[PDB]
């Protein structure tokens, strides 16, 4: 999204086709023009003419499928009853697949996820709002309901509600590079109370909202982060999501990585040799430098 | 003394460019008055109902809008359920 103002003629039309508003209605209509508009079950994508977690796969390719259509009454109708029936931890990914279903597609999303937000299960919760995250995400909108909608569970004291809220602004505000959304976000990263997996994702979401962006506050907190833990801890199975914001906040730009590089030289060499290789191959992608 | 402004709500595919004045004894206007613009054109309760402005959240009934920021082009969103009782 380019910020600029008013003064331009047709602005409002110039925004609007920069914030893809359209794009979802072009989208369907095409779509529709096509014919290709039937939710495809996943039941006949798999040919089944001859189980939580497969069922779980089901639901997932049903959203990958009807991503972006908005159109798929098997977790519109009855989803309450498959969330239900469904075991553990999927609850999330569901609702977050209802979400895929209804990307780019703001007003209708919204309102047809805004009753799975009152959910009883915190998974379910924490999945309605990484949907509404998957929902606003990509497309740019005027009052920017994502940033209202996170309000208590951008910081909440609960690890799942927190994950989902801070991976949906991550969607959301990638590429927007917006101030106010880095500015409460990072203040979310240096928090303590989140596992190391949340940090991770609270990275994740840095990085993908300020991509290619050099943003030098987020490299201090990511690397303040990192020094704050300790390495055995770090080094586990979920560190690897620091040095992933770390590449994508200097994505394209190169030259520059030796002072970040230097600075994180004080790491241990189990998590120092992959950080710094993946920020390293992140920040001179696509530049044929072999 | 009617102290209009327009602001463009925006829910379930449906917008209206409404120009909404203080009704409520305010010299501008706030969330009351827009509360009950909303629940006079669709009937959400003030409980549920979400108004959302600049990414910013509405929590404090009391808090004026206008001072908050909303000005003629500015666009809020409506989230919830048309309710028929």
Same mark, same amino acid.
């Given at each position: 999204?380019?910020?600029?103002?008013?003064?331009?003629?047709?602005?409002?039309?110039?925004?609007?086709?920069?914030?893809?508003? #359209?794009?979802?209605?072009? &989208?369907?209509?095409?779509?529709?023009?096509?014919?290709?508009?039937?939710?495809?079950?996943?039941?006949?994508?798999?040919?089944?003419?001859?189980?939580?977690?497969?069922? *779980?796969?089901?639901?997932?390719?049903?959203?990958?499928?009807?991503?972006?259509?908005? #159109?798929?009454?098997?977790?519109?109708?009855?989803?309450?009853?498959?969330?239900?029936?469904?075991?553990?931890?999927?609850?999330?990914?569901?609702?977050?697949?209802? $979400?895929?279903?209804?990307?780019?597609?703001?007003?209708?999303?919204?309102?047809?996820?805004?009753?799975?937000?009152?959910?009883?299960?915190?998974?379910?919760?924490?999945?309605?709002?990484?949907?509404?995250?998957?929902?606003?995400? $990509?497309?740019?909108?005027?009052?920017?309901?994502?940033?209202?909608?996170?309000?208590?569970?951008?910081?909440?004291?609960?690890?799942?509600?927190?994950? $989902?809220?801070? &991976?949906? *602004?991550?969607?959301?505000?990638?590429?927007?590079?917006?101030?106010?959304?880095?500015?409460?976000?990072?203040?979310?990263?240096?928090?303590?109370?989140?596992?190391?997996?949340?940090?991770?994702?609270?990275?994740?979401?840095?990085?993908?909202?300020?991509?290619?962006?050099?943003?030098?506050?987020?490299?201090?907190?990511?690397? #303040?982060?990192?020094?704050?833990?300790?390495?055995?801890?770090?080094?586990?199975?979920?560190?690897?999501?620091?040095?992933?914001?770390?590449?994508?906040?200097?994505?394209?730009?190169?030259?520059?990585?030796?002072?970040? *590089?230097?600075?994180?030289?004080?790491?241990?060499?189990?998590?120092?040799?992959?950080?710094?290789?993946?920020?390293?191959?992140?920040?001179?992608?696509?530049?044929?430098?072999? | 003394?009617?102290?209009? !402004?327009?602001?463009?709500?925006?829910?379930?595919?449906?917008?209206?460019?409404?120009?909404?004045?203080?009704?409520?004894?305010?010299?501008?206007?706030?969330?009351?008055? !827009?509360?009950?613009?909303?629940?006079?054109?669709?009937?959400?309760?003030?409980?549920?109902?979400?108004?959302?402005?600049?990414?910013?959240? !509405?929590?404090?009934?009391?808090?004026?809008?206008?001072? !908050?920021?909303?000005?003629?082009?500015?666009?809020?969103?409506?989230?919830?359920?048309?309710?028929?009782?």
């Amino acid at each position: 999204f380019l910020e600029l103002s008013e003064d331009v003629e047709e602005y409002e039309d110039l925004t609007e086709i920069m914030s893809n508003v #359209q794009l979802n209605s072009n &989208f369907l209509a095409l779509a529709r023009e096509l014919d290709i508009m039937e939710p495809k079950v996943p039941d006949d994508i798999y040919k089944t003419h001859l189980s939580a977690r497969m069922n *779980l796969a089901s639901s997932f390719v049903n959203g990958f499928v009807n991503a972006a259509f908005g #159109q798929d009454k098997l977790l519109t109708d009855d989803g309450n009853k498959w969330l239900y029936k469904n075991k553990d931890h999927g609850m999330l990914s569901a609702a977050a697949s209802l $979400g895929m279903i209804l990307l780019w597609d703001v007003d209708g999303g919204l309102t047809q996820i805004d009753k799975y937000l009152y959910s009883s299960e915190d998974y379910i919760k924490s999945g309605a709002l990484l949907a509404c995250g998957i929902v606003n995400s $990509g497309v740019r909108n005027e009052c920017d309901p994502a940033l209202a909608l996170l309000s208590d569970y951008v910081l909440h004291n609960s690890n799942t509600m927190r994950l $989902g809220s801070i &991976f949906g *602004l991550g969607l959301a505000y990638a590429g927007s590079n917006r101030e106010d959304v880095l500015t409460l976000l990072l203040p979310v990263m240096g928090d303590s109370k989140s596992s190391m997996e949340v940090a991770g994702v609270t990275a994740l979401a840095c990085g993908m909202i300020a991509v290619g962006s050099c943003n030098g506050d987020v490299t201090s907190t990511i690397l #303040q982060t990192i020094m704050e833990k300790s390495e055995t801890e770090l080094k586990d199975t979920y560190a690897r999501w620091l040095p992933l914001g770390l590449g994508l906040n200097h994505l394209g730009k190169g030259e520059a990585i030796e002072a970040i *590089l230097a600075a994180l030289e004080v790491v241990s060499e189990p998590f120092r040799s992959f950080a710094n290789t993946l920020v390293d191959v992140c920040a001179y992608a696509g530049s044929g430098n072999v | 003394a009617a102290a209009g !402004l327009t602001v463009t709500v925006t829910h379930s595919n449906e917008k209206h460019d409404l120009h909404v004045t203080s009704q409520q004894g305010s010299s501008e206007p706030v969330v009351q008055d !827009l509360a009950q613009v909303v629940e006079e054109v669709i009937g959400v309760p003030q409980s549920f109902q979400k108004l959302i402005f600049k990414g910013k959240s !509405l929590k404090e009934m009391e808090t004026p809008l206008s001072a !908050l920021g909303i000005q003629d082009g500015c666009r809020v969103m409506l989230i919830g359920k048309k309710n028929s009782p």
